[PDB]
Amino acid sequence: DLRPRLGRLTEETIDIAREVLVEGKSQSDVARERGLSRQRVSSMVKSVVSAANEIPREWQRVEVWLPPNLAEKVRQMEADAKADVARKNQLTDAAL
Amino acid sequence: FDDLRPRLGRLTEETIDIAREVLVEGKSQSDVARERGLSRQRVSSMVKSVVSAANEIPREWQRVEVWLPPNLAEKVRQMEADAKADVARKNQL
DNA sequence: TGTCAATAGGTGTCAATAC
DNA sequence: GTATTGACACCTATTGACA
């Protein structure tokens, strides 16, 4: 029933996230310090990062260099995908 | 050289710093290895890295940082591969 | 006086998987 | 949501073996 993402996460997950984001601690250090896999801490951080950008969880960040011709298309490629997602949340529940 | 620091992504201060000693300061490769405490094959790879960075990304290109669905994300990653590849032949030929 | 080449930990990410 | 391991890529390195 649409629970906002940052509200679903545990208090602990938000803590590990804070150590990495707010406090600049390394993910692997936080992982060892908390007896978790490093894969969990990376997955944890992505959850908070993705939701703070109003981004679907499955989306992957990409950092490439491109010609300005190709560059602008991928910048518009995002805006279109971003726009589509906003519309999808907007009318998918209504269209059914 | 200094107009490349944005393009040497995922590298280290010292790794770049040493590379400058060979390509800017013109020092000897084997001698910095003796100074900085490294083997010579190391400092060689560090040099080949920072050089191959330059001659693989034309400086007219733009840094794109972007959040995409997985399929499109790979497509943009594949796009860079093609663009980096066709640049190689124009530098090789 | 360096290069090629195999090799390897540390880290972060994607993937598949389980409860 | 909680969590695991397998794989890989891009780092940091080593030595062996040539030029």
Residue numbers in the entry:
A (entry chain A): 8 to 103
B (entry chain B): 6 to 98
Reproduce the article's own wording on this structure.
ArdK is a 102 amino acid protein encoded by the broad host range conjugative plasmid R388. In R388, ArdK represses the expression of five genes by its binding to their respective promoters (PardC, Porf7, Pssb, Porf12 and Porf14). The KorA family of transcriptional regulators includes plasmid-borne repressors involved in plasmid stability and conjugation. Our structural analyses show that ArdK, a member of this family, can form a symmetric dimer similar to that observed for KorA, yet it binds direct sequence repeats as a non-symmetric dimer.
To study the binding mechanism of ArdK, we obtained the crystal structure of the protein bound to its cognate DNA operator. We chose the operator present in the Pssb promoter (GTATTGACACCTATTGACA; underlining indicates the –35 box), as this was the promoter with the highest level of repression by ArdK. Two complementary 19mer oligonucleotides containing this sequence were annealed and bound to SeMet ArdK, as described in the Materials and Methods. Crystals of the ArdK–DNA complex were obtained, and the structure solved at 2.8 Å resolution. In the ArdKSE–DR crystal structure, we found an ArdK dimer bound to a single dsDNA molecule within the asymmetric unit. Each of the DR repeats is bound by each of the ArdK HTH domains. The main residues involved in specific interactions with the recognized sequence were R45 and Q46. R45 NH2 interacted with G2_C or G12_C O6, R45 Nϵ with G2_C or G12_C N7, and Q46 Nϵ2 with G6_D or G16_D O6. Hydrogen bonds with the DNA backbone phosphates, and van der Waals forces stabilize the DNA interaction. To achieve this rather unusual binding architecture, one of the HTHs had to rotate 180° relative to its apo position, while the other HTH motif and the dimerization domain remained at their original position.
